[PDB]
Specification:
- Chain A: Involved in nucleolar processing of pre-18S ribosomal RNA. Has a role in the nuclear export of 40S pre-ribosomal subunit to the cytoplasm.
- Chain A: It is found in: Nucleus, Nucleolus.
- Chain A: This is Nucleolar complex protein 14.
- Chain A: It comes from Saccharomyces cerevisiae (strain ATCC 204508 / S288c) (Baker's yeast).
- This is part of a larger assembly, with chains A (about 80 residues), B (about 45 residues), C (about 800 residues), D (about 220 residues) and E (about 210 residues).
- Chain C is an alpha+beta fold and about 800 residues long.
- The radius of gyration of chain C is 39 Å and the shape is extended.
- Chain C starts with a strand and ends with a helix.
- In chain D, strands 1, 2, 3, 4, 5, 6, 7, 8, 9 and 10 form a ten-stranded mixed beta sheet that branches.
- In chain D, helix 1 (about 25-35) links the parallel strand 1 (about 15-20) and strand 2.
- Chain E is an all-alpha fold and about 210 residues long.
- In chain E, strand 1 and strand 2 form a beta hairpin.
- In chain E, helix 2 packs parallel to helix 4 (about 110-120).
- The radius of gyration of chain E is 28 Å and the shape is elongated.
- The N and C termini of chain E lie far apart (about 100 Å).
- Classes of the chains: A mainly alpha (about 80), B alpha+beta (about 45), C alpha+beta (about 800), D alpha/beta (about 220), E mainly alpha (about 210).
Chain lengths: ~80, ~45, ~800, ~220, ~210
């Protein structure tokens, strides 16, 4: 049907010296008109995943794990916190 | 021969061959013709 | 959020409009800003303030200035008020129930006159855009729009249904035939503008820019083009300014007529027009010395038929007037002046002498106003209110009744404050003077002459009130104590520059002073220590405010933005741009970090100090908001402005071819219906006249567009385009081709629209029969055969008739050129 | 600037592009090829089945098409694209790595089909200028300056991120939205003749197995 | 030269100037001298704006008169007022309306009062009338009105006068070829008007 550009101009005419309304409206139209960072399946009788956010957290997790192992790698001491 | 512009600044001659005089024409047609030659002077 | 709203507005009695008078002297309807208030001249109490049912500041109030009322007008007998506003709308109210009956937007700019006509049911309206519209009240409809003036309607005069006559803000007076709504006769009245119009049936009177008042004779039953309205002579006035309202009366009990010309400044020139007996018995006296010269003298009439009268003056500049009369010794004239005040004068006249060297006002309603803009507003704990003016009109209004109960005379006073026990007012004036007043006793406790060398600009009490600070344009601030109830100057801090705002903290801690040199300085009161210098505002800087915790200050200026500063280190937080003219004042709430700022562009604005949003954008004033004051506890805020207003704020699709086909079918159906009607008429006129057909009523769309069917088909045939014309003619079948031939056969009898559409008729007809030639020559009907012959004869006659003069003009013009050549090549 | 086998018809003439699949394509590759033919304008799609590549190349370069995009898959997921410029010009062949397509995700409407704007981010080397020229002479020369679709070829360490966006320009900035397929393509081979032969001289191809392979970009 | 304050420079003389004597009655006659040549400047602004405002008054009266004539009918005095005011679209309208009603009713091509009013207009009026006819003749639509006006000028005026008016060859040479173009077009319309005659001879052969 109608274009994403036409719907985007309609969404901007919809949303229209306050700041937080513009922060909210801009974040809303960005996460609405960005469809390639969700994943949608087809219901055989729909947003089923958030690929980039899941990827970002899965790689930041192992990034801090890798830096922790690189910090541990040639240590021999350690504080023993019994508190 | 062809229809050029008007020879004095009290009238205009359109390419058509019809002419209006500044004083004689109504202000609605003066707005319309100003807008028209503005577009014709914009393209 | 617990938002704000407007509780009540007051302080205005007469605003930028006219006034209508109602009989019982009598009462008076006049304008406040955007709402109309009725007053009884006898006592002067505000008996009605007819206002819009929506409070300005509510949820559905729209984001602009409210429409200022600009013309009152009243229908007396059927009891209506037609009022008109500055956007162009006209609200008609019944004065019994005070609701809005009629809304009549219509115009595009502010409106300048109303008039009821034929006393009820018709209202004519002239506006600052040059249209003048007639409205019916039984149909709620703009009937007619008289549209030929060029600047702005300054007056008109109508009689019912046939003649209107208007005059506008160009030099032009125009007379309008209201049957055709075309302008009939136009003159240039005055060489600049034309501001006045009045007429008692024979003579018409107009005035323009400067003192030249022109008498005209309108002869309504004239027939010549120029001469329905002729000019009969000019005369002079005493005012060289714009006379801008003229109005007539016929006093009874002999019969006599009086008219006034109000002026721009301060003065109404009244005139008695005389009667025909003294016209006849005064003609000979200037016709003395006995005739070409005497005829020139008799032609050069105004001073003859018009007689000046008691020139009524006033204290202030005059905005509007209207009168009433009895006995010719009670010309009783109400007058609304610009500095808000109405005045009821009355001149007596013993029918030969006006019995006074100068007329006398019998009433004056001026108590609920100020005569100037309120340069400083203040409030009590919660009960009373303080308004400070330039004439001297300090006034102590009260919140719970909106009435000034106490008023004094100070001078050009720009700042004031209360005293912390109540019932006591400190004030500073624009010259080197300070003044003290109270509430129970009379005006002056004491004044201090030479309180400062130059203009004082801002003072502030301490929170206990015993010690106040005055900063003035003599580049000094001074401190004063209260000794026992008198003022004790003890110390004075001279700066390098003109201090123009002071403030202390609400806990006796800081003294923040705003200099003219684009900065503020924060001092310690206990040391004069020079704590901080806040800098970077980039124009001279107006009102400061310190928060309740004494941590956060605001800083307003003429840079159209307010800056938030943290007072611990003097570090800026925001620099938020409000208010596109100039923020005059800015004030916190009592207990919160929310604040208000009123500005020089007719708007107050509600902000928070944490997210720095704009909480609300309040839009009730009309002009420069000079001051605002917040309640000490609770937090309702008053704001006072340049439009003499003081207001409270509290909490809450076919195509070508088928278009031509349906046009052809209805057109030829009408055509042969009328032809059958004509055959019926000839048979019932050639036979026994006992019967005939009843009536073919003409077609709905044909009488709706006012066209004969040949013209209707002709313009839709015009309105198809040349690219799809050969398709529009190819789509239609042969029955529509036959009725197209009937259409062409009828249209070349009306030889007017045959000759104006010859190549179109030729192109369409020749393509039609060229495309349908195989079927046309197989039709067997002598009616169509005679039809084709008739079309052929008339069409070829028209074409040879136009090429005859074409060939004539070719040979004649080349003869002209050739005889010029053989003359002088 | 425009190099020696594109300079004859740089901005004189609009291009003409064929988009075609590998051989007996899967349905997601056919959807992908439709997305590529309405990614860039004056491109049409041709159903490759039982087409030989020499007479396909010969029929294209005597019909007058400027260039050819051949798409290769792996079980729906497209893996390669070869761009062959026909007047005995170059073939740049790329692998495609992170492909997300709008036919997979969302009926978000229809596309825009305007002559787009083009962004090229840090193609600094001469091989970068070469691949910029071969990627942008399959677009229409001289769009309108208020055209509201842009596409982007951004180099991110020899992985050209390829996206398409539409935009309006609002009061405080510019608001973007993502249309069409996102990629990271990477050039594994250039050569200087057409697609028919593989006897053409190689201008560049990546050396995967040298021991100084991962030290530099556009190696 | 002499200059006034700044606006309104005066013509002055050819060379240098040590002279200004302006000091008659209010500031009446001014005198200013070059080396030899005198100048005597006249008066105050008291009548050169009065004649301008009274010709404005006359013009706004006759414009309203022309509007009233154009409304109520009456095409002859409407024609001469449109010619006096030089309102060319109104002139085309009065000529087109009078020509159409001339085709309606019934030597004479307009009504007799209007073509007598065309017969009695002078040289500069008929040169602006023929300039109007010149640039109406460039249409194929508005050309019939131009041809009727050219024809009544030709048959009501003197041909030697029309030739010797200064400027009447740069107009008639402009509008000979346009009339020839229209003659060719209307003659071809008469030529292809005989399909009606052919269709009639077939319809008569039908039995």
């Amino acid at each position: 049907a109608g274009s994403q550009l036409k719907n985007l101009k309609a969404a901007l005419k919809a949303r229209g010296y306050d700041r937080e309304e513009k922060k909210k409206a801009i974040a809303e139209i960005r996460e609405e008109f960005n469809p390639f960072e969700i994943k949608a399946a087809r219901n055989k009788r729909i947003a089923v995943g958030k690929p980039g956010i899941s990827k970002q957290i899965g790689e930041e997790q192992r990034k801090r794990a890798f830096e922790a192992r690189k910090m541990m790698k040639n240590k021999r001491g350690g504080v023993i916190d019994k508190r | 021969y062809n229809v050029g512009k008007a020879e004095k600044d009290g009238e205009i001659r359109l390419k058509n061959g019809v002419a209006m005089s500044k004083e004689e024409l109504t202000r609605e047609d003066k707005n319309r013709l100003r807008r028209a030659l503005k577009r014709k002077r914009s393209k | 959020y617990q938002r704000f709203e407007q509780a009540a507005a007051f302080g205005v009695i007469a605003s930028n409009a006219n006034c209508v008078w109602i009989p019982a002297p009598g009462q008076l309807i006049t304008s406040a800003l955007e709402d109309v208030n009725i007053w009884d001249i006898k006592t002067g109490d505000l008996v009605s303030k007819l206002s819009d049912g929506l409070p300005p500041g509510a949820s559905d109030a729209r984001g602009a200035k409210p429409a200022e009322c600009t013309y009152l007008e009243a229908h007396k007998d059927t009891d209506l008020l037609a009022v008109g506003y500055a956007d162009g709308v006209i609200k008609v109210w019944d004065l019994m129930s005070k609701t809005v009956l009629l809304n009549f937007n219509g115009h595009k700019a502010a409106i300048t006159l109303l008039q009821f006509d034929g006393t009820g049911t018709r209202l004519i309206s002239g506006s600052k855009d040059s249209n003048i519209i007639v409205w019916d009240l039984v149909g709620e409809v703009g009937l007619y729009k008289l549209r030929s003036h060029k600047d702005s309607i300054t007056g008109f005069w109508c009689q019912g249904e046939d003649w209107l006559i208007s005059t506008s803000k160009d030099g032009m007076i125009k007379l309008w035939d209201l049957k055709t709504h075309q302008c009939i006769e136009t003159h240039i009245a005055h060489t600049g503008e034309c501001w006045g119009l009045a007429v008692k049936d024979d003579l018409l009177i107009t005035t323009g820019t400067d003192s030249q008042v022109k008498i005209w004779k309108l002869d309504i039953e004239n027939d010549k083009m120029g001469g329905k309205l002729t000019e009969m002579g000019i005369f002079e006035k005493q005012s060289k300014q714009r006379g801008l309202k003229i109005e007539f009366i016929t006093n009874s009990s002999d019969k006599t007529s009086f008219f006034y010309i109000q002026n721009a400044d301060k003065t109404i020139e009244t005139f008695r027009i005389r009667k025909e007996e003294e016209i006849a018995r005064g003609l000979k006296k200037r016709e003395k010395r006995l005739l070409t010269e005497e005829e020139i003298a008799k032609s050069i009439y105004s001073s003859f038929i018009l007689h000046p009268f008691q020139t009524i003056r006033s204290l202030y500049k005059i905005k509007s007037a209207s009168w009433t009369t009895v006995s010719s010794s009670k010309l009783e004239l109400v007058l609304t002046t610009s500095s808000n005040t109405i005045e009821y004068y009355s001149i007596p006249y013993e029918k030969r002498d006006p019995t006074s060297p100068a007329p006398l006002k019998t009433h004056t309603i001026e108590l609920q106003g100020q005569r100037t803009d309120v340069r400083s507003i203040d409030i009590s704990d919660d009960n009373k209110l303080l308004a400070t003016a330039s004439n001297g009109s300090l006034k102590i209004w009260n919140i719970k009744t909106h009435k000034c109960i106490r008023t004094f005379e100070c001078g050009y006073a720009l700042t004031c404050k209360f005293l912390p026990g109540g019932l006591l007012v400190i004030l500073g004036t624009r010259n080197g003077e300070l003044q003290l007043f109270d509430l129970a006793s009379s005006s002056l406790l004491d004044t201090i002459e030479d309180a400062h060398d130059a203009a004082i600009w801002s003072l502030d009490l301490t929170s206990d009130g015993k010690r106040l600070v005055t900063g003035s344009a003599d580049k000094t601030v001074k401190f004063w104590d209260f000794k026992v109830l008198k003022l004790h100057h003890d110390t004075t801090l001279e700066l390098t520059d003109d201090i123009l705002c002071v403030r202390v903290s609400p806990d006796d801690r800081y003294l923040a002073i705003s200099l003219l040199d684009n900065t503020v300085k924060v001092f310690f009161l206990d040391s004069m220590k020079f704590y901080l210098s806040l800098y970077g505002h980039k124009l001279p800087v107006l009102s400061i405010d310190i928060s309740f915790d004494s941590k956060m200050i605001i800083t307003s200026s003429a840079d159209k933005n307010i800056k938030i500063w943290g007072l611990d280190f003097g570090d800026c937080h925001k620099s938020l741009f409000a208010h596109q003219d100039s923020i005059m004042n800015v004030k916190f709430l009592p207990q919160s970090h929310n604040f208000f700022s009123c500005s020089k562009d007719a708007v107050v604005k509600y902000w928070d100090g944490e997210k720095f949003e704009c909480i609300q954008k309040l839009y009730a004033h009309q002009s420069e908001v000079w001051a605002l004051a917040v309640a000490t506890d609770g937090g309702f805020v008053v704001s006072s402005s340049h439009d003499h207003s003081i207001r409270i704020w509290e909490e809450t699709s076919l195509k070508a071819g088928e278009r031509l086909m349906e046009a052809l079918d209805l057109g030829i159906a009408e055509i042969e219906g009328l032809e059958a009607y004509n055959r019926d008429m000839k048979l019932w006129q050639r036979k026994k006249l006992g019967e005939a057909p009843i009536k073919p009523q003409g077609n709905a769309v044909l009488i709706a567009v006012n066209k004969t069917p040949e013209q209707y088909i002709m313009d839709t045939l015009l309105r198809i385009r040349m690219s799809q014309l050969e398709d529009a003619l190819m789509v239609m079948p042969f029955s529509y081709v036959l009725k197209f031939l009937k259409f062409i056969d009828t249209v070349m009898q009306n030889k007017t629209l045959l000759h104006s559409h010859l190549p179109l008729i030729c192109k369409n007809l020749f393509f039609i029969i060229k495309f349908n030639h195989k079927e046309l020559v197989s039709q067997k009907n002598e009616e169509l055969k005679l039809q084709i012959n008739r079309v052929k004869t008339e069409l070829r006659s028209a074409l040879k008739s136009t090429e005859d003069d074409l060939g004539f003009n070719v040979q004649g013009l080349k003869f002209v050129k050739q005889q010029w050549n053989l003359r002088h090549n | 600037q425009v190099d020696d086998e594109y300079a004859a018809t740089s901005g004189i003439m609009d291009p003409r592009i064929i988009v075609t699949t590998s051989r007996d394509p899967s349905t997601r590759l056919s959807q992908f090829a439709k997305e590529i033919k309405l990614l860039f304008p004056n491109a049409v799609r041709l159903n490759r089945g039982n087409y030989v590549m020499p007479n396909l190349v010969d029929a294209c370069k005597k019909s007058g098409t400027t260039d050819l995009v051949v798409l290769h898959e792996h079980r729906g997921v497209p893996t390669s694209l070869t761009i062959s410029h026909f007047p005995h010009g170059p073939t740049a062949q790329f692998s495609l790595h992170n492909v997300v397509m709008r036919h997979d995700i969302i009926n978000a409407g229809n596309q825009s089909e305007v002559n787009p704007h083009l962004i090229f981010d840090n193609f600094t080397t001469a091989l970068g200028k070469r691949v910029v020229c071969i990627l942008k002479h399959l677009f229409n020369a001289g769009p309108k300056k208020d055209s509201e679709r842009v596409i982007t070829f951004a180099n991110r360490g020899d992985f050209i991120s390829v996206r398409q966006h539409v935009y309006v320009r609002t009061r405080e900035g510019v608001e973007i939205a993502e249309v069409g397929p996102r990629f990271e393509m990477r050039l594994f081979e250039l050569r200087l003749g057409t697609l028919e032969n593989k006897d053409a001289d190689v201008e560049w191809q990546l050396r995967r197995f040298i021991r100084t392979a991962n030290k530099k970009d556009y190696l | 030269d002499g200059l006034i304050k700044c606006l309104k420079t005066l013509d002055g003389h050819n060379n240098r100037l040590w002279a200004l004597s302006t000091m008659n009655d209010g500031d009446m006659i001014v005198s200013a001298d070059a080396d030899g040549v005198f100048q005597f400047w006249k008066d105050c602004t008291e009548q050169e704006i009065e004649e301008e405002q009274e010709k404005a008054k006359l013009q706004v009266e006759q414009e309203q008169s022309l509007q009233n004539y154009m409304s109520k009918g009456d095409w002859t005095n409407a024609f001469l007022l449109a010619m006096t005011l030089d309102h060319p679209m109104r002139l085309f309208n009065v000529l087109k309306r009078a020509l159409g009603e001339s085709r309606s009713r019934q030597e004479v091509i307009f009504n007799e009062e209007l073509d007598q009013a065309i017969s009695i207009l002078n040289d500069e009026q008929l040169i602006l009338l023929m300039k109007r006819c010149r640039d109406w003749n460039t249409n194929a639509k508005t050309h019939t009105i131009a041809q009727r006006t050219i024809r009544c000028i030709l048959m009501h005026h003197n041909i030697a006068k029309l030739s010797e008016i200064p400027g009447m060859v740069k107009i008639v040479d402009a509008i000979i070829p346009y009339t020839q173009r229209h003659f060719t077009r209307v003659d071809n319309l008469v030529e292809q008007s005989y399909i009606l005659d052919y269709a009639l001879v077939e319809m008569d052969k039908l039995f």
